[PDB]
């Protein structure tokens, strides 16, 4: 749909059988989720943001449903304060920025 | 303009007589820019990111031109690694998210 930016653009996602809300985030290259239970194997990474770097786990080929749309991609799970959906999956759902 | 998200959504801004590039960042409530010289009054502030917190200076009523659109608002200046335009200015230029 179209979403204006007067409030945070949150969406519901379903991931790993669980329902969460996430922020649509054009500044983020990748998707980063708060720590959660996910099968099964993963690789450690660092990411940097404002504030500094964090260490995260990388899971590839995870299925996520963002609104009704399915996508498969990498997710990073880790100590984020907020679930962020970045450009790796925003492109899959066809999201654009328009002004 | 419409921007797809296959690459980072960067724009040119003019602020304070200087020309910069900045990310359009729907996840950011506010705008924060790397250290640069602005004239005038500011207040200290601290913002939290992935990774932690930074201390930043808040300047109010700063004119920015983003693409060919002028906006006025608060900018936070500080040690961010990248300049981000957040929703406080994104609403002023009429930016929407569309999927
Ligand atoms: O750290 C932030 N990252 C860091 C980040 C890095 C990597 C990924 C995955 O690849 C995801 C997020 C982004 C901005 C940024 C990108 C690259 C380098 C430096 C900064 C993000 O794009 C922005 O949306 C918020 C996301 C966010 C929002 C709330 C709480 C935590 C995280 N932030 C922090 C931020 C907070 C406040 C303001 C001003 O109000 C601006 C930014």
From Swiss-Prot, chains A, B:
Where on the tree of life does the source sit, at the highest rank? Viruses
Q: Quick one: where's region Dimerization of protease? A: 1-5, 49-55, 88-99
Q: Show the active-site residues.
A: 25 (for protease activity)
Give all residue intervals belonging to the Peptidase A2 domain: 20-89
What does this gene product do? Aspartyl protease that mediates proteolytic cleavages of Gag and Gag-Pol polyproteins during or shortly after the release of the virion from the plasma membrane. Cleavages take place as an ordered, step-wise cascade to yield mature proteins. This process is called maturation. Displays maximal activity during the budding process just prior to particle release from the cell. Also cleaves Nef and Vif, probably concomitantly with viral structural proteins on maturation of virus particles. Hydrolyzes host EIF4GI and PABP1 in order to shut off the capped cellular mRNA translation.
**Subunit:** Homodimer, whose active site consists of two apposed aspartic acid residues.
Instruction: Output this protein's name.
Output: Protease
Native species? Human immunodeficiency virus type 1 group M subtype B (isolate BH10)
Name of the encoding gene: gag-pol
